């Protein structure tokens, strides 16, 4: 009977919660009590990238830490040269409603997606000087919220149809489909080793997935609202989530618990994007207050702000060498900070 | 450098094209289409000409882009802000849903579901200034229905005879009473006309009215 299984199901949650309590030896704040705070992190706009004529929703650095791509509701996907602020490419999109970007680790491809439920992949290193669309991945029933290349041939995507998928670009078919989320999946972050990935959903729950097997390993429960952003710690052994509750929290996969909550009573708006530093010592978050805060991930003190945007900070990224931070905004400007 | 000089020339060539594309896009009129499954939005779209469906049509030297986002079937709160800045919101409601009920729920009227959606939309924080065009479809079938069935089934309180004019007026006025921003956004209600093709003309007229009012706003002459 349904009641039999439900009463049985809630008993499993009891064991999970009890085990989580038993392993909560000490709060991370206590362990990091003697760590010197990071101090005031005053970062300044070194380059201002102009040319987008609408809101910006997604950006993604390159692996060379010089090139970056950005998408905006104007229907343009622009590859920037951050060093010189000159535009390398301007890719027109078939659908102006784009909510994510991706720069392939090899630099040969970029991807984007949104309300069209398709992940379009573009080839940059062609032999005709132009940038051309390579494949169109059409197997989702809810708008695309995020996407990240694994290789030149594998891309994993999250959608608002409560499922994440893994694709084969050459064949254009889903090698694996990840299901189990009860709400719209907002963002996914790939592990450094490209063996796992976590996804945050509107059901206020984050799940760790296995790319090969296709089954969820862990599910982390936290604050009750749509998780809007998620990113891996650089070691791949943790991740931080940002939701509409105006809170960012740090989960761990090995401990399978929650360590920190980055909340300040003044902040009442929702977090739109999160991203770490090369050392993972700074957790940068782009809120709706028109500003981007910099959090000390090990002390939970707001040390740093990036206030240069007339509108909300949609996206926020760091380089592979951590020499810069770029932030998009609804004000149509990307700013390189350092 | 020479290579750097050529790269800067390329970037300026890109900037010129971006500006031209933006100037071409600014002339376009962006319309958002909402409503229930059977409201008649499909019929309206047919009159005007997966995921998000875009319809492009030109009327009286004005370019309109209509976005039928009813095939999304996900949480609206996550992607509705993407439509901030549209000229208006075309909203469709079927007058022939007063005596019906959704095939899933027990006794929740379809008309009340449309009213719930309309209240959610017109009071949304993203559409404080955005005007709403309200289409009331299936008016002839509604006339046939009301000639035989009573209107009390949906609205418990109703002072009026079972006549099309008064019943339709009551439903319209009930729908126009949901908006609290009475002096910021204007609700333009229209009754669907099939052959006359006056639906696109009404959308045109409402769009020009909002454009002219905004023009008077930003220039201080109002």
């Amino acid at each position: 009977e349904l009641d039999q299984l439900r009463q049985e199901a809630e008993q499993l949650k009891n064991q999970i919660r009890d085990a989580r309590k038993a392993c909560a030896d000490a709060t991370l704040s206590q362990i990091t009590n003697n760590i010197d705070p990071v101090g005031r992190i005053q970062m300044r706009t070194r380059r201002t990238l102009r040319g987008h004529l609408a809101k910006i929703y997604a950006m993604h650095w390159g692996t060379d830490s010089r090139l970056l791509v950005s998408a905006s509701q104007d229907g343009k996907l622009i590859i920037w040269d951050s060093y010189t602020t000159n535009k390398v490419h301007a890719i027109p999109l078939r659908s102006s409603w784009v909510m994510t970007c991706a720069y392939a680790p090899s630099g040969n491809y970029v991807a984007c997606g949104g309300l069209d439920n398709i992940c379009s992949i573009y080839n940059l290193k062609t032999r005709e000087g132009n940038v051309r669309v390579s494949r169109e991945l059409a197997g989702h029933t809810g708008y695309l919220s995020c996407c990240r290349f694994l290789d030149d041939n594998q891309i994993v995507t999250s959608s608002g149809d409560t499922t994440c998928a893994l694709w084969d670009i050459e064949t254009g078919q889903q090698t694996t489909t990840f299901t189990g989320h009860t709400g719209d999946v907002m963002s996914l972050s790939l592990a450094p080793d490209t063996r796992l990935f976590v996804s945050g959903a509107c059901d206020a729950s984050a799940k760790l997935w296995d790319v090969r097997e296709g089954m969820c390993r862990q599910t982390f429960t936290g604050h009750e609202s749509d998780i809007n952003a998620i990113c891996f710690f650089p070691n791949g052994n943790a991740f931080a989530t940002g939701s509409d509750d105006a809170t960012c929290r740090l989960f761990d996969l090995r401990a399978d618990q929650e360590l920190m909550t980055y909340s300040h009573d003044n902040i009442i708006c929702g977090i739109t994007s999160v991203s770490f530093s090369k050392s993972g010592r700074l957790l940068l978050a782009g809120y709706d207050d028109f500003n981007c805060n910099v959090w000390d991930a090990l002390k939970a003190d707001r040390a740093g702000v990036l206030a240069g945007h007339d509108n909300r900070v949609s996206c926020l990224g760091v380089t592979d060498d951590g020499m810069a931070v770029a932030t998009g905004s609804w004000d149509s400007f990307l700013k390189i900070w350092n | 450098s020479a290579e750097d000089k050529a790269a800067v020339e390329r970037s300026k060539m890109i900037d010129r094209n971006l500006r031209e594309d933006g100037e071409k896009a600014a002339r376009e009129v962006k319309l958002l289409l909402l409503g229930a499954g059977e409201s008649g939005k499909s019929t309206i779209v047919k009159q005007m000409k997966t995921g998000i469906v875009e319809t492009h049509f030109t009327f009286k030297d004005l370019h309109f882009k209509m976005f039928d986002v009813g095939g999304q079937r996900s949480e609206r709160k996550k992607w509705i802000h993407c439509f901030e800045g549209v000229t208006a919101i075309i909203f469709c409601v079927a007058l022939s849903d007063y005596d019906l009920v959704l095939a899933e729920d027990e006794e929740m009227n379809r008309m009340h579901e449309s009213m719930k959606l309309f209240d959610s939309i017109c009071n949304n924080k993203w559409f404080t200034d955005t005007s709403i065009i309200l289409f009331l479809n299936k008016k002839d079938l509604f006339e046939e229905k009301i000639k035989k069935s009573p209107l009390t089934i949906c609205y418990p309180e109703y002072a009026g005879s079972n006549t099309y004019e008064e019943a339709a007026a009551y439903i319209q006025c009930q729908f126009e009473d949901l908006n609290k921003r009475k002096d910021t956004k204007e609700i333009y209600t229209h009754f669907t006309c099939a052959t006359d093709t006056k639906n696109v003309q009404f959308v045109f007229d409402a769009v020009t009215d909002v454009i002219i009012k905004n023009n008077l706003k930003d220039c201080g002459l109002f």
Partner: single-chain antibody
Amino acid sequence: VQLVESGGGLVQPGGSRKLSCSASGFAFSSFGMHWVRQAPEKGLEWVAYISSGSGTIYYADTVKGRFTISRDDPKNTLFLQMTSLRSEDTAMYYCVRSIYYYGSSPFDFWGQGTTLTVSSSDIVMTQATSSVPVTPGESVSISCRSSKSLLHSNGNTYLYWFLQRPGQSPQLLIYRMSNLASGVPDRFSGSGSGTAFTLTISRLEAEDVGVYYCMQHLEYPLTFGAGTKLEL
């Protein structure tokens, strides 16, 4: 992605002839086009250039004011107007395409060229080696010298390499020191610093025999070097 040039032939001194190259198979409008000429028995020599959009036109000192270069993007064609041809203008005129953006490979595709026979402060690149004997398989190194530091402040060493097989157009191998072009075997490799440059081949074959050229791009007029033929 072919490039074909037209014109040439026999012209008496003092006449004016027009050279045209019709591009096909790529986005011509976003490519900067060059013209390079080769004497009947001597090396290459740059003459002209247009940038993308016709916004920058340069010429060689020996044709300045005499030649006129123009492009017609809608038809994907490149033109060269020549006036009062001198006896020193006998050469086969190549057309080269190039695109400049971060990471691109300029001078990557060369046309077949046309033959023209007239009846009758600049960096110098020097490579005094010619007809070096060699054998398929062995390791051979080609040396080049410059009179100026080609290493720019931004960190790019604008020294290129080309290979002209017998009866074929020049083919790019290395678009900048320590970089390899697309579609060329991995055997070719070149390293250098400052003004001393080298091109190394691990194992070669009968296919890669020919004359090797060196070109710099630090500043115009893109002076070439003398040929370096591999003997076989």
